[PDB]
Amino acid sequence: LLSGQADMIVAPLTINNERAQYIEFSKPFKYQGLTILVKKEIPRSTLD
Amino acid sequence: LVTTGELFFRSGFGIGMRKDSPWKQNVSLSILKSHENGFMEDLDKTWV
Amino acid sequence: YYVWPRDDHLSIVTLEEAPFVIVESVDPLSGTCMRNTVPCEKRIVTENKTDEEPGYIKKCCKGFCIDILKKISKSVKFTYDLYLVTNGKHGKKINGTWNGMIGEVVMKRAYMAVGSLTINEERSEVVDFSVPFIETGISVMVSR
């Protein structure tokens, strides 16, 4: 964007301090947060 | 696999722009207008 | 009570509702607002017969938005003196005029609207907002 070869950055962008300091955003179009992912489960004990 | 946990720091998304370009005001207004027509919810339920 | 009539000194038109901002009466003590709050300035025009002076019955304010406003005011070194609402809840185009807090801001003398506001395609053409600082929306309420 900043050099000479872009005008809109339609992409998974995200608001923060420095990027909003150096360019002007618009109103947000999604309110996603930051979260964590792990793997699912399986059956269990009692054996014999 | 599955996602767990809560949401820490929660920014938003957004279409970026240049600094002082003629579009910014109108593009922000268009995003805000479309966000109150179910359009964002419509596309979210269509794809995500 | 001219508030010491004496370029960073601006009015702040606020409102009290929810755990966002709550207004309490002055701490009795000796007639002064307690600590951990900022002195608000309630305005009363309850005189329904004569054009009496507005009621300058001061009070105290505390909550979410006032705390964030204090943090911001410290952050950029500007002085402030809060001031409550006189008529209307928030503001609405009532036959081509804003009757409320946004009307107070657009009609000068306010220069801020910190409170419980909603960003919409209805006031961006008269005032202009900042980045939202809480996720609002429309949801439901059903008993479990």
d(Cα C87, Cα C13) in Å, to the nearest integer? 12
Q: With an 8 Å Cβ cutoff, are A28 and C132 in contact? A: yes
Question: What is the distance in angstroms between the CA of the first residue and the CA of the last residue of chain B?
Answer: 17
- In angstroms, the separation between the Cα of residue A15 and the nearest Cα of chain C is 10
Smallest CA–CA distance from A15 into chain C, residue: C131
The one-letter code for the residue type at B2 is V
- Work out the number of other CB atoms within 10 angstroms of the CB of residue C60: 20
B-chain CB neighbours of C139 within 8 Å are: none
CA distance C43 to chain A (A): 35
**Which DSSP state fits C17?**
B
**Contact check, Cβ <8 Å, C119/A27:** yes
Tell whether A17 is within 8 A of chain B (Cβ).
Answer: no
Q: Which residue of B has its CA nearest to A16?
A: B11
Resolution of the coordinates in A? Answer: 4.1
Q: Are C112 and C13 in contact (CB under 8 A)?
A: yes
* C123 known ligand binder: yes
Phi, psi of C135 (to 5 degrees): -90, 100
Contacts with A22 (C-beta within 8 Å, 6 or more apart), sequence order: A2, B19
Q: Which residues contact A46 (CB under 8 A, 6 or more apart)?
A: none
Q: How far apart are CA C115 and CA C128, in angstroms?
A: 15
Report d(CA C125, CA C117) in Å as an integer. Answer: 16
A31 touches chain C (CB under 8 A): yes
Measured between alpha carbons, how far is C76 from C81 in angstroms, rounded to an integer? Answer: 15
User: What is the C-alpha separation between C73 and C131, in angstroms, rounded?
Assistant: 17
In whole angstroms, how large is the CA radius of gyration of chain C? 17
Residue among C121, C133, C138 with most chain B CBs within 10 A, to mutate: C121
